[PDB]
């Protein structure tokens, strides 16, 4: 019997804090953010990976386009990104301030995406 174990299942809480801090040490110029497909996202495809490294000098317009590039998102269809599970950030806000405004207790950043403006 199959079992699709997400990143948090294959990496215990200890391994998670250790991974985040080690990432902050080796890649101090990158922010560890989780990009997960919404549980009801049926139209849009699943992201190839979940752990991303974004430079603090960028904005969401760019991050959105990077995901659109590899996910090969359609032009006739649109989507939104919810931070920690809430869509309240503007596309022009720098990820540096967004990171410290949404930082989790383990120090990781969570993000979920879907093709809908309201859940």
């Amino acid at each position: 019997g199959a079992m699709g174990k997400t990143f948090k299942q294959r990496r215990t809480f200890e391994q998670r804090v250790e991974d985040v801090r080690l990432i902050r040490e080796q890649h101090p110029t990158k922010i560890p953010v989780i990009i997960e497909r919404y549980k009801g996202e049926k139209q849009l495809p699943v992201l190839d990976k979940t752990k991303f490294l974004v430079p603090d000098h960028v904005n969401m317009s760019e991050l959105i386009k990077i995901i659109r590039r590899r996910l090969q998102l359609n032009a006739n269809q649109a989507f939104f990104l919810l931070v920690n599970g809430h869509s309240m950030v503007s596309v022009s806000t720098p990820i540096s301030e967004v990171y410290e405004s949404e930082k989790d207790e383990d120090g990781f950043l969570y993000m979920v995406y879907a093709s809908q403006e309201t859940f």
Partner: peptide, 17 residues
């Protein structure tokens, strides 16, 4: 989970430095 190495776990953003 005996064997374990630094697999591709994180995916950095594409930019121009």
């Amino acid at each position: 989970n005996s064997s374990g190495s630094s697999e591709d776990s994180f995916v950095e953003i594409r930019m121009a430095e």
